[PDB]
């Protein structure tokens, strides 16, 4: 239902932020 | 209802973050 | 009510991230 | 109540993203 | 309960974004 | 349940943002 849909969109948000954090780390060294 | 509106806005947020992740990588 | 207020704040969050994405893309090219 | 507390924290999040978007714009000029 | 837990994580998120905004301003 | 799942994804989001904040400062 709708609460699961919210949780799934939040999981997608976490995945994009993890990619951004990865690239941050890479830039730093 | 409003729970669907919340999920739709979160989907929009995820798409914008995906774009940001791409561009940041391209700029770098 | 309160669920509508939450959706409205998420809409504001989405708009600010769209502004950031736009600038990122402008800078990139 | 807790739903109002959630909305308030989302308002704080939008404000910080607005600041970040501002700096992006400043960087672009 | 879980609604309080959600509000607390959102507070932590706002705090990290405040740090990012600060660092943004400083790096620039 | 589903509210716990939401809280857990939000915790993960806070973690990734803390990492971004940390690496930024280094840069």
PDB file of C-alpha atoms in Angstrom:
ATOM      1  CA  UNK A   1       0.000   0.000   0.000  1.00  0.00           C
ATOM      2  CA  UNK A   2       0.865   3.708   0.362  1.00  0.00           C
ATOM      3  CA  UNK A   3       3.224   3.519   3.370  1.00  0.00           C
ATOM      4  CA  UNK A   4       5.325   0.912   1.513  1.00  0.00           C
ATOM      5  CA  UNK A   5       5.415   3.292  -1.489  1.00  0.00           C
ATOM      6  CA  UNK A   6       6.825   6.009   0.775  1.00  0.00           C
ATOM      7  CA  UNK A   7       9.448   3.645   2.181  1.00  0.00           C
ATOM      8  CA  UNK A   8      10.452   2.610  -1.363  1.00  0.00           C
ATOM      9  CA  UNK A   9      10.901   6.224  -2.537  1.00  0.00           C
ATOM     10  CA  UNK A  10      12.979   6.929   0.593  1.00  0.00           C
ATOM     11  CA  UNK A  11      15.147   3.874  -0.230  1.00  0.00           C
ATOM     12  CA  UNK A  12      15.731   5.369  -3.713  1.00  0.00           C
ATOM     13  CA  UNK A  13      16.664   8.702  -2.124  1.00  0.00           C
ATOM     14  CA  UNK A  14      19.204   6.934   0.150  1.00  0.00           C
ATOM     15  CA  UNK A  15      20.721   5.191  -2.894  1.00  0.00           C
ATOM     16  CA  UNK A  16      21.296   8.480  -4.764  1.00  0.00           C
ATOM     17  CA  UNK A  17      22.810  10.075  -1.647  1.00  0.00           C
ATOM     18  CA  UNK A  18      25.136   7.103  -1.213  1.00  0.00           C
ATOM     19  CA  UNK A  19      26.303   7.595  -4.829  1.00  0.00           C
ATOM     20  CA  UNK A  20      26.901  11.314  -4.069  1.00  0.00           C
ATOM     21  CA  UNK A  21      28.806  10.416  -0.878  1.00  0.00           C
ATOM     22  CA  UNK A  22      30.893   7.914  -2.806  1.00  0.00           C
ATOM     23  CA  UNK A  23      31.950  10.569  -5.348  1.00  0.00           C
ATOM     24  CA  UNK A  24      32.712  12.983  -2.506  1.00  0.00           C
ATOM     25  CA  UNK A  25      35.066  10.488  -0.936  1.00  0.00           C
ATOM     26  CA  UNK A  26      36.663   9.858  -4.333  1.00  0.00           C
ATOM     27  CA  UNK A  27      37.290  13.574  -4.904  1.00  0.00           C
ATOM     28  CA  UNK A  28      38.783  13.965  -1.417  1.00  0.00           C
ATOM     29  CA  UNK A  29      41.214  11.040  -2.084  1.00  0.00           C
TER      30      UNK A  29
ATOM     31  CA  UNK B   1      -5.248  11.003  -0.864  1.00  0.00           C
ATOM     32  CA  UNK B   2      -2.471  12.824   1.030  1.00  0.00           C
ATOM     33  CA  UNK B   3      -0.366   9.683   1.559  1.00  0.00           C
ATOM     34  CA  UNK B   4      -0.198   9.298  -2.247  1.00  0.00           C
ATOM     35  CA  UNK B   5       0.723  13.005  -2.559  1.00  0.00           C
ATOM     36  CA  UNK B   6       3.578  12.409  -0.110  1.00  0.00           C
ATOM     37  CA  UNK B   7       4.878   9.413  -2.103  1.00  0.00           C
ATOM     38  CA  UNK B   8       4.683  11.455  -5.345  1.00  0.00           C
ATOM     39  CA  UNK B   9       6.723  14.283  -3.917  1.00  0.00           C
ATOM     40  CA  UNK B  10       9.297  11.790  -2.649  1.00  0.00           C
ATOM     41  CA  UNK B  11       9.525  10.306  -6.122  1.00  0.00           C
ATOM     42  CA  UNK B  12      10.200  13.819  -7.470  1.00  0.00           C
ATOM     43  CA  UNK B  13      12.918  14.283  -4.828  1.00  0.00           C
ATOM     44  CA  UNK B  14      14.581  11.015  -5.842  1.00  0.00           C
ATOM     45  CA  UNK B  15      14.627  12.099  -9.531  1.00  0.00           C
ATOM     46  CA  UNK B  16      16.247  15.459  -8.679  1.00  0.00           C
ATOM     47  CA  UNK B  17      18.887  13.730  -6.579  1.00  0.00           C
ATOM     48  CA  UNK B  18      19.595  11.349  -9.435  1.00  0.00           C
ATOM     49  CA  UNK B  19      20.210  14.371 -11.693  1.00  0.00           C
ATOM     50  CA  UNK B  20      22.454  15.977  -9.060  1.00  0.00           C
ATOM     51  CA  UNK B  21      24.489  12.794  -8.711  1.00  0.00           C
ATOM     52  CA  UNK B  22      25.055  12.646 -12.500  1.00  0.00           C
ATOM     53  CA  UNK B  23      26.084  16.311 -12.892  1.00  0.00           C
ATOM     54  CA  UNK B  24      28.356  16.282  -9.891  1.00  0.00           C
ATOM     55  CA  UNK B  25      30.239  13.382 -11.454  1.00  0.00           C
ATOM     56  CA  UNK B  26      30.378  15.159 -14.835  1.00  0.00           C
ATOM     57  CA  UNK B  27      31.710  18.400 -13.219  1.00  0.00           C
ATOM     58  CA  UNK B  28      34.310  16.498 -11.241  1.00  0.00           C
TER      59      UNK B  28
ATOM     60  CA  UNK C   1      -4.634  18.998   8.046  1.00  0.00           C
ATOM     61  CA  UNK C   2      -1.267  17.608   9.169  1.00  0.00           C
ATOM     62  CA  UNK C   3      -0.702  15.157   6.281  1.00  0.00           C
ATOM     63  CA  UNK C   4      -1.326  17.997   3.795  1.00  0.00           C
ATOM     64  CA  UNK C   5       1.256  20.161   5.621  1.00  0.00           C
ATOM     65  CA  UNK C   6       3.771  17.322   5.275  1.00  0.00           C
ATOM     66  CA  UNK C   7       3.073  16.983   1.529  1.00  0.00           C
ATOM     67  CA  UNK C   8       3.431  20.772   1.126  1.00  0.00           C
ATOM     68  CA  UNK C   9       6.835  20.805   2.813  1.00  0.00           C
ATOM     69  CA  UNK C  10       7.979  17.918   0.617  1.00  0.00           C
ATOM     70  CA  UNK C  11       6.878  19.952  -2.415  1.00  0.00           C
ATOM     71  CA  UNK C  12       9.082  22.836  -1.209  1.00  0.00           C
ATOM     72  CA  UNK C  13      11.964  20.410  -0.735  1.00  0.00           C
ATOM     73  CA  UNK C  14      11.468  19.081  -4.264  1.00  0.00           C
ATOM     74  CA  UNK C  15      11.544  22.627  -5.695  1.00  0.00           C
ATOM     75  CA  UNK C  16      14.823  23.498  -3.943  1.00  0.00           C
ATOM     76  CA  UNK C  17      16.444  20.294  -5.216  1.00  0.00           C
ATOM     77  CA  UNK C  18      15.230  21.138  -8.748  1.00  0.00           C
ATOM     78  CA  UNK C  19      16.928  24.540  -8.393  1.00  0.00           C
ATOM     79  CA  UNK C  20      20.136  22.812  -7.271  1.00  0.00           C
ATOM     80  CA  UNK C  21      19.979  20.330 -10.148  1.00  0.00           C
ATOM     81  CA  UNK C  22      19.510  23.136 -12.605  1.00  0.00           C
ATOM     82  CA  UNK C  23      22.571  25.028 -11.340  1.00  0.00           C
ATOM     83  CA  UNK C  24      24.623  21.839 -11.363  1.00  0.00           C
ATOM     84  CA  UNK C  25      23.718  21.297 -15.003  1.00  0.00           C
ATOM     85  CA  UNK C  26      24.429  24.960 -15.936  1.00  0.00           C
ATOM     86  CA  UNK C  27      27.826  24.801 -14.296  1.00  0.00           C
ATOM     87  CA  UNK C  28      28.560  21.503 -16.050  1.00  0.00           C
ATOM     88  CA  UNK C  29      27.981  22.997 -19.524  1.00  0.00           C
TER      89      UNK C  29
ATOM     90  CA  UNK D   1       1.565  15.953  18.195  1.00  0.00           C
ATOM     91  CA  UNK D   2       4.149  14.033  16.257  1.00  0.00           C
ATOM     92  CA  UNK D   3       2.696  14.727  12.772  1.00  0.00           C
ATOM     93  CA  UNK D   4       3.142  18.470  13.361  1.00  0.00           C
ATOM     94  CA  UNK D   5       6.683  17.779  14.580  1.00  0.00           C
ATOM     95  CA  UNK D   6       7.407  15.917  11.335  1.00  0.00           C
ATOM     96  CA  UNK D   7       6.082  18.856   9.269  1.00  0.00           C
ATOM     97  CA  UNK D   8       8.252  21.274  11.248  1.00  0.00           C
ATOM     98  CA  UNK D   9      11.391  19.238  10.668  1.00  0.00           C
ATOM     99  CA  UNK D  10      10.545  19.095   6.953  1.00  0.00           C
ATOM    100  CA  UNK D  11      10.256  22.899   7.023  1.00  0.00           C
ATOM    101  CA  UNK D  12      13.755  23.105   8.520  1.00  0.00           C
ATOM    102  CA  UNK D  13      15.034  20.784   5.785  1.00  0.00           C
ATOM    103  CA  UNK D  14      13.527  22.978   3.039  1.00  0.00           C
ATOM    104  CA  UNK D  15      15.203  26.081   4.597  1.00  0.00           C
ATOM    105  CA  UNK D  16      18.626  24.440   4.594  1.00  0.00           C
ATOM    106  CA  UNK D  17      18.172  23.307   0.979  1.00  0.00           C
ATOM    107  CA  UNK D  18      17.142  26.856   0.038  1.00  0.00           C
ATOM    108  CA  UNK D  19      20.458  28.049   1.548  1.00  0.00           C
ATOM    109  CA  UNK D  20      22.415  25.437  -0.428  1.00  0.00           C
ATOM    110  CA  UNK D  21      20.548  26.413  -3.646  1.00  0.00           C
ATOM    111  CA  UNK D  22      21.393  30.038  -2.927  1.00  0.00           C
ATOM    112  CA  UNK D  23      25.101  29.223  -2.660  1.00  0.00           C
ATOM    113  CA  UNK D  24      24.882  27.265  -5.882  1.00  0.00           C
ATOM    114  CA  UNK D  25      23.390  30.327  -7.594  1.00  0.00           C
ATOM    115  CA  UNK D  26      26.097  32.522  -6.064  1.00  0.00           C
ATOM    116  CA  UNK D  27      28.791  30.198  -7.369  1.00  0.00           C
ATOM    117  CA  UNK D  28      27.229  30.381 -10.848  1.00  0.00           C
ATOM    118  CA  UNK D  29      27.039  34.207 -10.270  1.00  0.00           C
TER     119      UNK D  29
ATOM    120  CA  UNK E   1       6.868   5.228  19.073  1.00  0.00           C
ATOM    121  CA  UNK E   2       7.735   5.259  15.413  1.00  0.00           C
ATOM    122  CA  UNK E   3       6.286   8.695  14.559  1.00  0.00           C
ATOM    123  CA  UNK E   4       8.700  10.225  17.099  1.00  0.00           C
ATOM    124  CA  UNK E   5      11.551   8.196  15.629  1.00  0.00           C
ATOM    125  CA  UNK E   6      10.713   9.602  12.212  1.00  0.00           C
ATOM    126  CA  UNK E   7      10.729  13.225  13.523  1.00  0.00           C
ATOM    127  CA  UNK E   8      14.109  12.598  15.202  1.00  0.00           C
ATOM    128  CA  UNK E   9      15.725  11.309  11.984  1.00  0.00           C
ATOM    129  CA  UNK E  10      14.391  14.303  10.082  1.00  0.00           C
ATOM    130  CA  UNK E  11      15.971  16.552  12.731  1.00  0.00           C
ATOM    131  CA  UNK E  12      19.324  14.786  12.182  1.00  0.00           C
ATOM    132  CA  UNK E  13      18.894  15.286   8.415  1.00  0.00           C
ATOM    133  CA  UNK E  14      18.263  19.038   8.890  1.00  0.00           C
ATOM    134  CA  UNK E  15      21.388  19.276  11.033  1.00  0.00           C
ATOM    135  CA  UNK E  16      23.640  17.584   8.398  1.00  0.00           C
ATOM    136  CA  UNK E  17      22.190  19.851   5.697  1.00  0.00           C
ATOM    137  CA  UNK E  18      23.005  22.877   7.899  1.00  0.00           C
ATOM    138  CA  UNK E  19      26.594  21.645   8.031  1.00  0.00           C
ATOM    139  CA  UNK E  20      26.647  21.183   4.227  1.00  0.00           C
ATOM    140  CA  UNK E  21      25.253  24.726   3.734  1.00  0.00           C
ATOM    141  CA  UNK E  22      27.960  26.094   6.037  1.00  0.00           C
ATOM    142  CA  UNK E  23      30.762  24.221   4.284  1.00  0.00           C
ATOM    143  CA  UNK E  24      29.361  25.330   0.921  1.00  0.00           C
ATOM    144  CA  UNK E  25      29.583  28.936   1.981  1.00  0.00           C
ATOM    145  CA  UNK E  26      33.138  28.395   3.337  1.00  0.00           C
ATOM    146  CA  UNK E  27      34.530  26.377   0.400  1.00  0.00           C
ATOM    147  CA  UNK E  28      33.160  29.088  -1.874  1.00  0.00           C
TER     148      UNK E  28
ATOM    149  CA  UNK F   1       6.096  -2.642  10.125  1.00  0.00           C
ATOM    150  CA  UNK F   2       5.923   0.120   7.529  1.00  0.00           C
ATOM    151  CA  UNK F   3       6.543   3.114   9.861  1.00  0.00           C
ATOM    152  CA  UNK F   4       9.704   1.394  11.159  1.00  0.00           C
ATOM    153  CA  UNK F   5      10.850   0.907   7.529  1.00  0.00           C
ATOM    154  CA  UNK F   6      10.367   4.626   6.920  1.00  0.00           C
ATOM    155  CA  UNK F   7      12.397   5.505  10.041  1.00  0.00           C
ATOM    156  CA  UNK F   8      15.171   3.145   8.918  1.00  0.00           C
ATOM    157  CA  UNK F   9      15.481   4.683   5.423  1.00  0.00           C
ATOM    158  CA  UNK F  10      15.559   8.133   7.015  1.00  0.00           C
ATOM    159  CA  UNK F  11      18.423   6.949   9.269  1.00  0.00           C
ATOM    160  CA  UNK F  12      20.294   5.795   6.159  1.00  0.00           C
ATOM    161  CA  UNK F  13      19.670   9.201   4.530  1.00  0.00           C
ATOM    162  CA  UNK F  14      21.067  10.972   7.618  1.00  0.00           C
ATOM    163  CA  UNK F  15      24.139   8.702   7.485  1.00  0.00           C
ATOM    164  CA  UNK F  16      24.880   9.485   3.826  1.00  0.00           C
ATOM    165  CA  UNK F  17      24.453  13.194   4.467  1.00  0.00           C
ATOM    166  CA  UNK F  18      26.887  12.998   7.405  1.00  0.00           C
ATOM    167  CA  UNK F  19      29.411  11.327   5.081  1.00  0.00           C
ATOM    168  CA  UNK F  20      28.893  14.053   2.450  1.00  0.00           C
ATOM    169  CA  UNK F  21      29.333  16.715   5.108  1.00  0.00           C
ATOM    170  CA  UNK F  22      32.547  15.064   6.318  1.00  0.00           C
ATOM    171  CA  UNK F  23      34.150  14.749   2.870  1.00  0.00           C
ATOM    172  CA  UNK F  24      33.105  18.275   1.950  1.00  0.00           C
ATOM    173  CA  UNK F  25      34.873  19.759   4.922  1.00  0.00           C
ATOM    174  CA  UNK F  26      37.980  17.802   3.898  1.00  0.00           C
ATOM    175  CA  UNK F  27      37.740  19.330   0.410  1.00  0.00           C
TER     176      UNK F  27
END
